[PDB]
Amino acid sequence: VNSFSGYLKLTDNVYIKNADIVEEAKKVKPTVVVNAANVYLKHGGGVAGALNKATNNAMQVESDDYIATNGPLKVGGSCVLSGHNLAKHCLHVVGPNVNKGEDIQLLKSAYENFNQHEVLLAPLLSAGIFGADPIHSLRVCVDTVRTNVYLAVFDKNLYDKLVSSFL
């Protein structure tokens, strides 16, 4: 039993809710919240900008030190950093950004990072300002992640479309 509430069960291990991931993280304080990161960990907008804003920019400060030490992530890769006031840990995962021309096949590699964590609160990777089809992202999630994932979808209209079209 865990503390996640109000989710629709899609499969054995994937759950979904119309929710603001920031507000959901603040209430649940999950072990892991996933950020929709870019390779530079520049948290300017989308989910990343919202998560970082909720940390009062502490996520960005920590991220800048990470990049200065380690260099950029790979598209499809990830790193574990602090969850600050939102979670124990933040798993920064880089899905391909279609608006930069990155290969969508890398979306499966991106979701594979979730399998290193037993339970996660996450957005749909490569959705929103990353330009991929969220219906496709949900399909890849279900077909790739084997650990327990709680997906937060900000847009109510999109949430209803994802549920109604789910196979």
From Swiss-Prot:
Q: Which domain of life is it from?
A: Viruses
Compartments annotated for it: namely: Host endoplasmic reticulum membrane
Q: Where is the Macro domain?
A: 1-167
Query: For this protein, what reaction is catalysed?
Result: Thiol-dependent hydrolysis of ester, thioester, amide, peptide and isopeptide bonds formed by the C-terminal Gly of ubiquitin (a 76-residue protein attached to proteins as an intracellular targeting signal)
Record membrane topology: Multi-pass membrane protein
Question: What regulates the activity here?
Answer: Inhibited in vitro by GRL-0617.
Job description of the protein: Responsible for the cleavages located at the N-terminus of the replicase polyprotein. Participates together with nsp4 in the assembly of virally-induced cytoplasmic double-membrane vesicles necessary for viral replication. Antagonizes innate immune induction of type I interferon by blocking the phosphorylation, dimerization and subsequent nuclear translocation of host IRF3. Also prevents host NF-kappa-B signaling. In addition, PL-PRO possesses a deubiquitinating/deISGylating activity and processes both 'Lys-48'- and 'Lys-63'-linked polyubiquitin chains from cellular substrates.
Record text on subunit structure and interactions: May form homohexamers. Interacts with N protein.
By what name is this protein known?
Papain-like protease nsp3
Native organism: Severe acute respiratory syndrome coronavirus 2
Instruction: List the top taxonomic levels of the source.
Output: Viruses, Riboviria, Orthornavirae, Pisuviricota, Pisoniviricetes
What gene is it encoded by? rep
Q: Which residues of the full protein are shown?
A: 1025 to 1191 of 7096
